[PDB]
Amino acid sequence: LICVNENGGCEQYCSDHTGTKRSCRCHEGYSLLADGVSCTPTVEYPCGKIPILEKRNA
Amino acid sequence: IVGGKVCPKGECPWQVLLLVNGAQLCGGTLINTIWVVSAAHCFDKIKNWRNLIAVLGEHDLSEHDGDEQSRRVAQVIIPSTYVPGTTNHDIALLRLHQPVVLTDHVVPLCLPERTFSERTLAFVRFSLVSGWGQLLDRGATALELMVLNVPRLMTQDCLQQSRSPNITEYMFCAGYSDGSKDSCKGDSGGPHATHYRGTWYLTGIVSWGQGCATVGHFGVYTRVSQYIEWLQKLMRSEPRPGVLLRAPFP
Ligand SMILES: [NH3+]CC1CCCCC1
Ligand SMILES: [Ca+2]
Ligand SMILES: [Cl-]
Ligand SMILES: [Cl-]
Ligand SMILES: [Cl-]
Ligand SMILES: [Cl-]
């Protein structure tokens, strides 16, 4: 897989590696799930999420 | 903002209001607890640098509800390539004197990695621009925070569809050419924010245009992806005496 197509399947950030290797990464205040693509908050107020709306659909 | 709507209180929690001697100067974007991104041109006429205030958690300017947090601006960092009175490299990085406290009403916008921003975010058509700027060209500024969804144009297509500064690689166009919807005076420095898979990211800064909502013209926005590494390096740097810092770019 490649980062320039479909974000490499990553929810957030994507690095291409020597070989057919891709690594997804997450912003500070998030951790990468075992699927290797998804990012989940590790703190109360992660960047780029709107608490009153996250609470609205939680 | 022209032709938008009120941003419901708390739904634009990264929005910053910049004040000089208590008067409205500009907008800005919170990107973590101490750092705010704005527009270089906001500071072209500053005389006393020690009178700059940033306010987070702001919504209705006519009242205090207690969610507001004010901080002195300790540093203003502007790239060496910016020339006052002109439009290219229209970006400024502000250090707050004390961190803000993250709350339901005060949340940073994610500063994306460059590659992600160039390869993915740049192709998200619509993004949100916000501010307490003028509601109409030659009109009064907003008392409640306004927000506007604007489509991004490829620069070739902006130049083709527009009808005088250049559109450089450090800029992009977004909005409408029919005079209905635009960012306006007072909105300068504020966020152009882009949603991708559940999270919002900083892609632009309210920069300039041919007046406000001028028919045949689009809003011009600083292309933040060109500045990610520059910003990241400065955020790791020790503070320097004196508010203004001109820092080399690239
Ligand atoms: N978008 C057009 C406006 C022009 C005045 C400064 C903010 C941007
Ligand atoms: Ca208020
Ligand atoms: Cl002082
Ligand atoms: Cl240093
Ligand atoms: Cl000092
Ligand atoms: Cl000073």
Coordinates of C-alpha atoms and ligand atoms in Angstrom, one line a residue:
Chain A
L1 CA 0.0 0.0 0.0
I2 CA 1.0 3.6 -0.6
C3 CA 0.3 6.8 1.3
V4 CA -0.6 8.9 -1.8
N5 CA -3.5 6.6 -2.6
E6 CA -6.4 6.7 -0.2
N7 CA -4.1 7.9 2.6
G8 CA -2.6 4.4 2.6
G9 CA -5.7 3.3 4.5
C10 CA -4.5 5.3 7.5
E11 CA -7.0 7.3 9.6
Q12 CA -4.3 10.0 10.1
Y13 CA -0.6 10.0 9.1
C14 CA 1.2 7.6 6.8
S15 CA 4.9 6.7 6.0
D16 CA 6.1 4.7 3.0
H17 CA 9.0 2.2 3.8
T18 CA 11.6 0.4 1.8
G19 CA 9.8 -2.6 0.3
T20 CA 6.0 -2.9 0.1
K21 CA 5.9 -1.5 3.7
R22 CA 3.6 1.2 5.0
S23 CA 3.3 2.5 8.6
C24 CA 0.4 4.5 9.9
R25 CA 0.8 7.0 12.8
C26 CA -1.3 9.1 15.0
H27 CA -1.0 12.7 16.3
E28 CA 0.0 13.3 19.9
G29 CA -2.9 12.6 22.2
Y30 CA -3.9 9.5 20.1
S31 CA -2.7 5.9 19.9
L32 CA -2.8 3.5 16.9
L33 CA -5.1 0.5 17.2
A34 CA -4.1 -3.1 16.4
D35 CA -5.6 -2.8 12.9
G36 CA -2.6 -0.6 12.2
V37 CA -4.7 2.2 10.7
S38 CA -7.1 3.6 13.3
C39 CA -6.3 6.3 15.9
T40 CA -8.1 6.5 19.3
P41 CA -7.8 9.4 21.8
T42 CA -5.6 8.9 24.8
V43 CA -6.5 12.2 26.5
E44 CA -9.6 14.1 27.4
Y45 CA -9.1 16.9 24.9
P46 CA -7.4 15.6 21.7
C47 CA -6.7 18.0 18.9
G48 CA -9.3 18.4 16.2
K49 CA -12.3 16.9 18.1
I50 CA -15.3 19.0 19.3
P51 CA -16.2 17.9 22.8
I52 CA -19.9 19.0 22.8
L53 CA -20.4 17.0 19.6
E54 CA -18.4 14.0 20.7
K55 CA -20.6 14.0 23.8
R56 CA -23.7 14.5 21.7
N57 CA -23.0 11.2 19.8
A58 CA -21.4 9.2 22.7
Chain B
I1 CA -17.4 36.5 7.8
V2 CA -19.9 37.2 5.0
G3 CA -22.8 34.9 4.2
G4 CA -22.1 32.3 6.9
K5 CA -23.9 31.5 10.2
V6 CA -23.2 31.6 13.9
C7 CA -20.8 29.0 15.0
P8 CA -22.7 27.3 17.9
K9 CA -20.9 28.0 21.2
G10 CA -18.1 25.4 21.6
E11 CA -18.2 24.1 18.0
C12 CA -15.3 26.3 17.0
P13 CA -13.1 25.7 20.1
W14 CA -9.8 26.3 18.5
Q15 CA -10.7 29.8 17.4
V16 CA -8.6 32.6 18.9
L17 CA -9.5 36.3 19.2
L18 CA -6.5 38.7 19.2
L19 CA -6.8 42.1 20.9
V20 CA -4.5 45.1 21.1
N21 CA -5.4 47.5 23.9
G22 CA -8.7 45.7 24.2
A23 CA -9.6 46.3 20.6
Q24 CA -10.3 43.6 18.0
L25 CA -7.2 43.0 15.8
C26 CA -7.4 39.5 14.3
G27 CA -8.2 35.9 14.5
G28 CA -5.9 33.0 15.2
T29 CA -5.8 29.2 15.7
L30 CA -4.9 27.3 18.8
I31 CA -2.7 24.3 17.8
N32 CA -1.7 23.2 21.4
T33 CA -1.8 24.7 24.9
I34 CA 0.8 27.5 24.3
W35 CA 0.9 28.0 20.5
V36 CA -1.4 30.0 18.2
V37 CA -1.1 30.3 14.5
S38 CA -2.2 33.7 12.9
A39 CA -1.4 35.9 9.8
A40 CA 1.8 38.0 9.6
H41 CA -0.1 41.0 8.2
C42 CA -2.0 41.3 11.5
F43 CA 1.2 42.8 13.0
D44 CA 2.3 45.3 10.3
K45 CA 1.2 48.3 12.4
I46 CA 1.9 47.1 15.9
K47 CA 3.7 49.7 18.0
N48 CA 3.6 48.3 21.6
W49 CA 4.1 44.6 21.3
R50 CA 3.5 44.2 25.0
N51 CA -0.3 45.0 24.6
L52 CA -1.3 41.9 22.6
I53 CA -3.9 39.6 24.1
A54 CA -5.1 36.2 22.9
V55 CA -8.6 35.1 24.1
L56 CA -9.7 31.4 23.9
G57 CA -13.2 30.1 24.7
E58 CA -14.7 33.3 23.3
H59 CA -18.1 33.3 21.6
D60 CA -20.3 36.3 22.3
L61 CA -18.2 39.5 22.6
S62 CA -21.0 41.4 24.4
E63 CA -20.8 39.2 27.5
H64 CA -18.6 37.2 29.9
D65 CA -19.9 33.6 30.5
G66 CA -16.7 32.3 32.3
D67 CA -15.5 30.0 29.5
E68 CA -13.1 32.7 28.1
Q69 CA -9.4 32.5 28.8
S70 CA -7.1 35.5 28.2
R71 CA -3.3 35.3 27.8
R72 CA -0.6 37.7 27.0
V73 CA 1.2 37.0 23.7
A74 CA 4.9 36.5 24.8
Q75 CA 6.3 36.0 21.3
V76 CA 5.3 36.7 17.7
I77 CA 7.4 34.7 15.2
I78 CA 7.3 35.8 11.5
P79 CA 9.2 34.2 8.7
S80 CA 12.2 36.1 7.2
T81 CA 10.5 35.9 3.8
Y82 CA 7.4 37.9 4.8
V83 CA 7.6 41.6 3.7
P84 CA 5.2 43.9 5.6
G85 CA 2.5 45.4 3.4
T86 CA 2.6 42.5 1.0
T87 CA 0.8 39.1 0.9
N88 CA 3.3 36.3 0.5
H89 CA 4.3 34.1 3.5
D90 CA 1.4 35.4 5.5
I91 CA 1.9 33.4 8.7
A92 CA 2.8 34.1 12.3
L93 CA 3.4 31.8 15.2
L94 CA 2.4 33.1 18.6
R95 CA 3.7 31.9 22.0
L96 CA 1.2 32.5 24.9
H97 CA 2.8 33.7 28.2
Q98 CA 1.0 30.9 30.1
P99 CA -0.7 27.8 28.6
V100 CA -4.5 27.9 28.2
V101 CA -6.5 25.1 30.1
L102 CA -8.1 22.7 27.7
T103 CA -11.9 22.5 28.3
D104 CA -15.1 21.7 26.4
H105 CA -14.8 25.3 25.0
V106 CA -11.0 25.4 24.4
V107 CA -9.5 22.7 22.2
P108 CA -6.5 22.9 19.8
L109 CA -6.8 22.2 16.0
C110 CA -4.4 19.5 14.8
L111 CA -1.4 20.8 12.9
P112 CA -1.1 18.0 10.2
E113 CA 2.1 16.4 8.9
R114 CA 3.0 18.0 5.5
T115 CA 2.6 14.8 3.5
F116 CA -0.8 14.1 4.9
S117 CA -1.8 17.7 4.3
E118 CA -0.5 17.7 0.7
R119 CA -1.6 14.2 -0.4
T120 CA -4.9 14.0 1.4
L121 CA -6.3 17.2 3.0
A122 CA -5.6 19.4 0.0
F123 CA -8.3 17.3 -1.9
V124 CA -11.0 17.7 0.7
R125 CA -13.2 20.2 -1.2
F126 CA -14.9 22.0 1.6
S127 CA -13.4 23.5 4.8
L128 CA -14.6 25.9 7.5
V129 CA -13.5 29.5 8.0
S130 CA -14.4 31.4 11.0
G131 CA -14.2 34.8 12.8
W132 CA -15.8 37.9 14.3
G133 CA -14.9 39.9 11.3
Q134 CA -17.2 42.2 9.2
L135 CA -20.5 40.6 8.3
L136 CA -20.6 42.6 5.0
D137 CA -18.1 44.5 2.9
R138 CA -18.0 48.0 4.5
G139 CA -20.2 46.6 7.4
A140 CA -20.1 46.1 11.1
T141 CA -18.1 43.2 12.7
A142 CA -19.9 40.3 14.3
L143 CA -20.6 40.0 18.0
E144 CA -21.1 36.3 17.8
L145 CA -18.5 34.0 16.2
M146 CA -19.4 33.2 12.6
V147 CA -18.3 30.3 10.5
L148 CA -18.5 29.6 6.7
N149 CA -18.0 26.4 4.5
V150 CA -15.9 27.2 1.5
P151 CA -14.7 25.1 -1.4
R152 CA -11.0 25.1 -2.3
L153 CA -9.8 25.7 -5.8
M154 CA -6.7 24.4 -7.6
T155 CA -4.6 27.5 -8.2
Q156 CA -4.6 27.2 -12.1
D157 CA -8.5 27.1 -11.8
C158 CA -8.5 30.0 -9.4
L159 CA -6.6 32.2 -11.8
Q160 CA -8.8 31.0 -14.7
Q161 CA -12.0 31.6 -12.8
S162 CA -11.0 35.0 -11.3
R163 CA -11.8 38.2 -13.1
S164 CA -3.1 42.6 -8.3
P165 CA -1.0 40.1 -6.3
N166 CA 0.0 36.7 -7.7
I167 CA -1.2 33.4 -6.2
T168 CA 2.1 31.9 -5.1
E169 CA 2.8 28.3 -4.0
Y170 CA 2.4 29.6 -0.4
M171 CA -1.3 30.4 -0.9
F172 CA -4.5 28.9 -2.1
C173 CA -7.9 30.2 -3.1
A174 CA -11.2 29.2 -1.5
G175 CA -14.8 30.4 -1.6
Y176 CA -17.1 31.8 -4.2
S177 CA -16.9 34.3 -7.1
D178 CA -20.5 35.5 -6.9
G179 CA -20.1 37.9 -4.0
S180 CA -22.2 36.0 -1.5
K181 CA -19.7 34.3 0.8
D182 CA -16.3 35.2 2.0
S183 CA -14.0 35.9 4.9
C184 CA -13.7 39.7 5.6
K185 CA -11.8 42.4 7.5
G186 CA -11.3 41.3 11.1
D187 CA -11.3 37.6 10.2
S188 CA -7.6 37.8 9.2
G189 CA -5.4 35.2 10.9
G190 CA -8.3 32.8 11.6
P191 CA -8.6 29.1 10.8
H192 CA -9.3 27.4 7.5
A193 CA -10.1 24.0 9.0
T194 CA -10.5 20.7 7.2
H195 CA -12.3 17.6 8.3
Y196 CA -10.9 14.1 7.5
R197 CA -12.2 10.8 9.0
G198 CA -13.6 12.4 12.2
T199 CA -10.8 14.9 13.0
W200 CA -10.2 18.5 12.1
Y201 CA -6.9 19.9 10.8
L202 CA -5.3 23.3 10.0
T203 CA -5.0 23.8 6.3
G204 CA -5.2 27.6 5.9
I205 CA -5.1 31.0 7.4
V206 CA -7.4 33.9 6.5
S207 CA -5.0 36.1 4.5
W208 CA -6.2 38.4 1.7
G209 CA -8.2 39.1 -1.4
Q210 CA -9.7 41.9 -3.6
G211 CA -11.8 43.4 -0.9
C212 CA -14.5 41.3 0.8
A213 CA -16.9 39.1 -1.2
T214 CA -15.9 40.9 -4.4
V215 CA -17.7 39.4 -7.5
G216 CA -15.3 37.6 -9.7
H217 CA -12.8 37.0 -6.9
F218 CA -12.1 34.3 -4.3
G219 CA -10.6 34.5 -0.8
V220 CA -6.9 33.8 -0.5
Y221 CA -5.5 31.6 2.3
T222 CA -2.0 30.9 3.5
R223 CA -1.1 27.4 2.5
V224 CA -0.1 26.0 5.9
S225 CA 1.4 22.8 4.5
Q226 CA 4.4 24.8 3.3
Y227 CA 5.1 25.8 6.9
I228 CA 4.7 22.6 9.0
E229 CA 8.4 21.9 9.5
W230 CA 9.2 25.6 10.1
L231 CA 6.5 25.8 12.8
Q232 CA 7.5 22.5 14.3
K233 CA 11.1 23.6 14.7
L234 CA 10.1 26.9 16.4
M235 CA 7.8 25.1 18.8
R236 CA 10.8 23.1 20.1
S237 CA 12.9 26.3 20.4
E238 CA 13.6 28.3 23.6
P239 CA 11.9 31.6 24.0
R240 CA 14.0 34.7 23.1
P241 CA 13.8 38.2 24.7
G242 CA 11.6 40.7 22.9
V243 CA 8.1 39.9 21.5
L244 CA 8.9 40.0 17.7
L245 CA 11.2 37.3 16.3
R246 CA 12.0 37.1 12.7
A247 CA 13.0 33.5 12.0
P248 CA 14.6 32.2 8.8
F249 CA 12.4 30.4 6.2
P250 CA 12.7 27.7 5.0
Ligands
LIG1 N1 -11.0 37.1 2.0 C1 -11.0 38.5 1.7 C2 -10.6 39.3 3.0 C3 -10.0 40.6 2.7 C4 -9.8 41.4 4.0 C5 -8.9 40.6 4.9 C6 -9.4 39.2 5.1 C7 -9.7 38.5 3.8
CA2 CA -18.0 36.1 25.8
CL3 CL 5.0 44.5 31.0
CL4 CL 17.0 26.6 20.7
CL5 CL 11.3 40.1 28.2
CL6 CL 9.6 44.0 23.3

